[PDB]
Design a protein around this ligand. Structure first.
Ligand SMILES: [Ca+2]
Ligand code: NA
Ligand code: NA
Ligand code: NA
Lengths: 151, 153, 152
């Protein structure tokens, strides 16, 4: 029973992996640690969420956005390791959101990422996390997600 | 008798707080190999978030220093829960801190020294760390700061 | 041999003197085979050359120049730690912070100043993943801060 089967059972198709925005690699590996560059909420090559939590998007939409960015991040991890069953653990999630001052519910939005990790990787998806808000995002994305995996 | 981090906390008159619950569906710490890393730690005292606002607007630099010190005390409580005896930590090799800072203030590195100085006070040479610092406009719980620690076991 | 040092020479780049910490922390630390710097600034001859905000005070090409200079500072730090830059197996990660005005989202182009220098100087050993942030307030009002992670 693989992460891939769970994606199928959840009705989730892994997107095509997006190109870097600059002269960097989409992931790197040091020893047993695999880490992604920033992953966006793309669907069918379109950046679906462009704006700010609390102003343009509700918390439930932010949740959806972090879920989709994480699906993109998982696509990136699959590209890197072939079979997602090779991943011993997704030990760390780090996420950035653009958030209006009137809203401090961004940890709920980032649960979109956390929840998918647990859904797809099970106990292997239990992770620590970091959260940031930034005023300006690449592509005006609502969010950016980074994953760290142990092989 | 023994020069443990715990004895230094006692000597400093510092009691470790109870470890706060996660704000979402994540672990308070994770371990990969010999690397133990916390999730975000807040300046809680007796279950109350003591600093809520922005450096330079709501809090002075010395208050930010105190806030980062308290968040780091919380982070040390988290580490103690994870490893039992803080003597088991070979080094706190990295501190990463976030503050909410008003444009009129660039003395946030001095605030984050509240964290760095406590790591050195409590862990001695094992507390020597590199560090990252960020400012963010919006914080969870409107906290003035958030601290993350990374330790080698 | 073609080495990072020889490539710096070829690019006409001199490594700056390594700046002091802004607080009670180490300029780098090491866990296992992983070396990680603290924040590195765009210093030239001991002067912080870029103080302000991308899109407001500095253009994208100036941001690129700033990130390049901060990265040259970071490489100076790496050379101090490792002695010979050939001993670095890889610069596996770059993490950069910029202060950026709402009117500008071309900060990834500015951070390419850092990414491009790593590739120019370290070649294949300079291929890295990266993280980018924007923060409203920076230490020393620097335009940018760069952090490097190297495998030893
Ligand atoms: Ca990191
Ligand atoms: Na909307
Ligand atoms: Na006040
Ligand atoms: Na200018």
């Amino acid at each position: 029973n693989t992460p891939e089967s769970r994606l199928v059972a959840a009705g989730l198709e892994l997107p095509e992996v997006a190109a870097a925005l600059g002269n960097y690699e989409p992931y790197s590996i040091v020893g047993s640690q695999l880490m992604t560059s920033g992953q966006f909420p793309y669907l069918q090559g379109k950046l679906l969420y462009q704006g700010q939590l609390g102003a343009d998007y509700t918390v439930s939409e932010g949740y959806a956005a972090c879920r989709l960015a994480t699906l993109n991040a998982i696509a990136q991890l699959k590209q890197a390791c072939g079979e997602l069953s090779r991943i011993k653990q997704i030990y760390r999630l780090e996420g950035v959101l653009n958030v209006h001052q009137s809203c401090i519910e961004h940890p709920k939005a980032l649960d979109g990422a956390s929840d998918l990790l647990l859904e797809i990787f099970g106990e292997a998806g239990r992770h620590s996390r970091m959260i940031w808000t930034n005023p300006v995002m690449p592509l005006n994305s609502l969010c950016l997600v980074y994953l760290f995996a142990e092989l």
